Amino acid sequence: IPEYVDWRQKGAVTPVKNQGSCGSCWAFSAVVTIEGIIKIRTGNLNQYSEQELLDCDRRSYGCNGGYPWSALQLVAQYGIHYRNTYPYEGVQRYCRSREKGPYAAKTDGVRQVQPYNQGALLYSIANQPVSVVLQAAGKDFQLYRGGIFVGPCGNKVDHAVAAVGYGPNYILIKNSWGTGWGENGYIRIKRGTGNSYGVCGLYTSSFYPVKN
Template identity: 30%
Template sequence: MAYQSDLGTDPLIIDDSNAGRFVEQWRDEGRAFGMTPRDYRVAPFGSASRPAVDLSMGPILERSQFADAIKRADEARTTPDDWRKAMEVPIQNQGSWGYCWAFGSVTAMTVTYAMTGHVAPNLNPFPVAYRIKGGRNQGGWAEQAYKGKADFGVPAHDVWPGNKEGMSQWQSPEVIASANRHKVTASLELPQNNFAALVTSLTHPKFARPVTMGLNWWGHLVCAVRAVALPGGGFGILIVNSWGPSWGQNGCGVLVESKSIAFEQIRIERCTPILAA
């Protein structure tokens, strides 16, 4: 019998048969989306890679290797999702703001911090998107968020709580200091629409990392934390959303392979080491 990942009780699985209905339902509920198509003339492919080299992921897996790689990662409990749960990374909530492109990206950053084995900082994505968009409630793409996280960093919720408006908060010494302590120092842009690259990043035995996924069919960006083997021999991706813990299964869901094809997918390699303040 083919290996199947343990997905817990009553997981939300999104596939071709229900995706359209779910998107309509979520729009009717007033959920905020916010991912816009990336302008590759302004932000060419690879511009989110810092430095612009393949740092640690190695060769992309062949499809015939998926099942074994997923089983090995599940049994070793080395996936980004295992670290996310062990270090109790909070589920973000973008509220009515179209800032999924920043919220999903900062979730990936927080999970990367968790994978160091230390308590992950409770980072706030809102100030990053708010600054990038000049206070406007406007969509974007992950590369914009990664640039902001590398250039000016991400403050924690304790110095900028929730989705609190006010650009002057960026002048606060506490906000500046917190943001400077939390930056992305290395990231890797994975090939577009390449499911194998996504599985490789999430199952690597030594260098597994979370990946942001920009999904055209959803108009939304989420954070991928685990590759899974589904009943019937198929594969999927466990995602962390930014619609609060009440969405899906504790803020998470599973996308089958056909719904995991991301036009933009960026893996975080390293963040600024956390030092004593």
Template identity: 30%
Template sequence: MQPFLSLLLALHVSLSTGNSFQKWTDAHGKVYQSEEERHSRSLIYAKNQLLVEKLSVADPDVVYDISGPFADLETSEFTSKLMSKRTVPQILEELREHSDQQSLPDSFDWEPKGLVAPVRNQKALGSCWAVSTAETVEGQLAKATGKLVPLSPEQLIECDASSDSTCAGGKGCADCGMFGGWPYLAYQFLQKAGGMFSEADWPYFKEGMFPCMPKGYSKALCGNHDDLYCRANSTKGQGPKDLCHATSGFTTPVSGWRSLSRNEEELAAQLIQFGPASVLIVADGLQFYHSGVFTGGLLGCQPDPSEGILGLDHAVLMVGFGKDHALFGHIKPYWRLKNSWGTSWGEQGYFRLERGTGRCGVNLAATVARVETSVVVV
């Protein structure tokens, strides 16, 4: 950071933010290792405060806010810590589900219908793919049985080393533990493994738990993470219980998956037909989102045309859709999406995204799990 800019930001911290940084750190339980780090984070906080003000002017229909959990992160840090920047599959068009055009309701939402579990917090791990996978399986299970049972993303993080050398034109795709992965491979892994455990039986990463990379992960596609500090015996999957190799105890089997339409009218009909869907998006513009129908922020939130779906970096759960009636009679159709950044972000952990324009690539890689109801074992 240039000295003059640092001086301006330091002045902004002292004059404009007052005690807001201290209040923010208290609210989020932030503890820094040194005064130097604290000062550095306060400057980033001040810079982000200016960015939020700029976003609010440029995009007045959306509320951006500095009070969320990522206010002390540079955009590059935010992207590297929480996004799954991995190659995604070019799913063959003939494998996609298509629906007859139907008259859609103005709004629909699976959350009040009991198919959506509480919002999770993936923390500083690239585990969105595992969370999104678990949540679409949860929806299928609840749809089949009437019982909403939170399932275990940790099972996928610790055990799933799936890879597909044929996807993305031969570039390859892989599930890489806490460094990213892809729901379609996770469905296939769960089908082969025999099923998915509940979150009660296999909790998510917590303090004192240091999982290793899944056995046999692709170093070519995931990078070499052999230097990762890990302690397999601190986990249920890789430790003494060895649940990664379990043959029983599953909450539900997974019998396969569906790839949904890119046509957003069809996709809305399929959401009603099949249940909550895992979708992949470009998410770096959502760091300071607080509420409203997101239409792209400063940069428009569209995948790089040269990358297509290869530029998608975050997995979330599509739970519904609706129409926002803004000022002067303007109507904004939207998707309602469940994130995995905790309830202090967005609309209690959810966000609304413009529908019908392919915003953030939301329609490019939507999938749902298949659950064989005749052998469900909840």
């Protein structure tokens, strides 16, 4: 369980993206999750469509609300297309999955990490990236243009992102905003403080598919 875990230089995460004026956090976080695992075994890095997840997942409320843990489940159940055969537009619409044709990616299950346990988060993040939530409605996290976020912030979780590494002290997160935020679309939050919930409630509820 290395002292350092970066999947970027591991060839697991692709360039950064933006959800835009679309409250669709959840589908983006997922595509990165599934994505990671998909490349971890096969040795093939891919960019899947979040747009599809939006238009297809009726359980989620597309362009403004969702469950990073429906998306995944969805995929495993059905599947998910490339981000070319289903590029992101930013507006929820009619499911094209079927109309689009044969799927391209399809997992083999979804599991959740025991909330409120850093030790647990890491491990999984060590075996493969994960979808995690937190407080973004933040007025500080909103302004982050590079650094180690300690706060201030709260325990009112409401935005989903992704963890793509950690250090002895900083946890790495991929944001669904442009590369005109944090440190090039990236933000480092601090771990090991005692805060069980985890600063910004980053330890509330996390997840991930399964792959054979």
